[PDB]
C-alpha cells in the first residue's frame, strides 16, 4: 500500500530486487494473480505496460535485460 | 495487507518464492526496513522468530536450508 | 567437468541452487549456449529431457514447480 | 574451464547472473567448496579479492550493491 515492484520470470527479477532494496519494499511475480487496487505506487521492471496491471504507476524497462538493469540503476541513482 | 512472505539473504529466498507462488502474494527481504503493522498474514521462511517482525503470523523453518524448503513444501501440499 | 546443474528461467532455478549447494558445483541457465561435452555429470532440474543437452546425465523433475522441488530434496536427502 | 562467475550470498548474485548471461557460462556460490584450478577465466562479482579463490582473474565490484551492478553493466557494454 506504499510501494510494490512487479516483474516477469527471468532476468528482470534481478533488476526488481535492486529497486525493491532502494525503496525498502516487497516484490511480486507478475504471474501471481494479485489485487493491485490498494497499492499507492506500483513499479514494473522490464517488458511493456500491457503485461502488467492497469494500476501501474512507473514502468522501468529498456530494449534488453541489460538496458532494463541500467534504467533501474539510473532511477535509483537519481532519486532525491 | 492480505499475505506477505519475508526471508533473509541466501537460500531461504528460494523457499519464500515457492510459498509466495502458492499464496499469490509478494515477498520481502528482511533487510528492508518495513512497516508490517497492516499486513494481515506475515509469513517468515527460515531462521528464528527473533530475526523478524513482531507482527509475524507463521514461521516456516527447519534445521537446514533443505529442511526449511521441505517444511514449506509440506505447508503448501497440506493447505485445504 | 565434475558436476553442473542446468535449469530454465523461472521457479526451477530455485530447485537447481539447492542441488548445486549439495553437490558444491556451479549452475547454468539453459538459455546460455554452452559446450556440455566435457562435463562429467550434467544435472537438469525441471521440464523434459528434450529441452536440454544430449550430454544430460540425470533429469530431476516433477509435474509442477513444487513437485520438481520435492524431487530435488528427495535426491539430496537420499544421497549416500 | 573457459568461464565461471563467482558471487557471495545476497544482492551480488543478481549482478553475477547478468555477467553469466553475457559470457554464456555458469555461476557458482562462493560458499560452495570448489576446485578452481582448471577454470580458464574466473570472474568474481562484488566484495574483495580476499574472499575468493587465488585463481581469480577478474574482480568486478564497487562500493555498494548498486555500484557493483553498474560495474558489471559497464564491463558487459564495453566488451568488443
Author numbering:
A (entry chain A), B (entry chain A), C (entry chain A), D (entry chain A): 195 to 274
Kindly provide excerpts from the paper associated with this entry.
Endolysins are produced by many double stranded DNA bacteriophages to effect the release of new virions from an infected cell by degrading the bacterial cell wall. Endolysins typically consist of a peptidoglycan hydrolase domain and a C-terminal domain that is often termed as a cell wall binding domain. Here, we present the crystal structures of autoproteolytic fragments of the CD27L and CTP1L endolysins, covering the C-terminal domain. We propose that the cleavage and oligomerization are linked, and they provide the endolysin with a trigger and release mechanism that leads to activation.
SDS-PAGE analysis confirmed that purified CTP1L wild type endolysin undergoes cleavage of the C-terminal domain. We then transferred the critical mutation that affected CD27L cleavage, involving the stem of the linker of the C-terminal domain of CTP1L (V195P). The SDS-PAGE analysis of purified recombinant CTP1L shows a reduction in cleavage for the V195P mutant. We attempted to crystallize the CTP1L V195P mutant to see if this slowly cleaving mutant would yield crystals of the full length protein. After 2 weeks, crystals appeared, an X-ray data set was collected to 2.1 Ångstrom and the structure of the C-terminal domain was solved by molecular replacement using the C-terminal domain of CD27L as a search model. As with CD27L, there was no N-terminal domain present in the crystal lattice. The C-terminal domain is truncated at Pro195, and there is only one molecule present in the asymmetric unit. The fold of the C-terminal domain of CTP1L is very similar to that of CD27L, except that the second alpha helix α2 is deleted, and the alpha helix α3 is extended in CTP1L. The head-on dimer is also present in the crystal lattice of the C-terminal domain of CTP1L. There is a similar side-by-side dimer present in the crystal lattice of the CTP1L C-terminal fragment, but the domains point in opposite directions compared to the same dimer observed in CD27L.
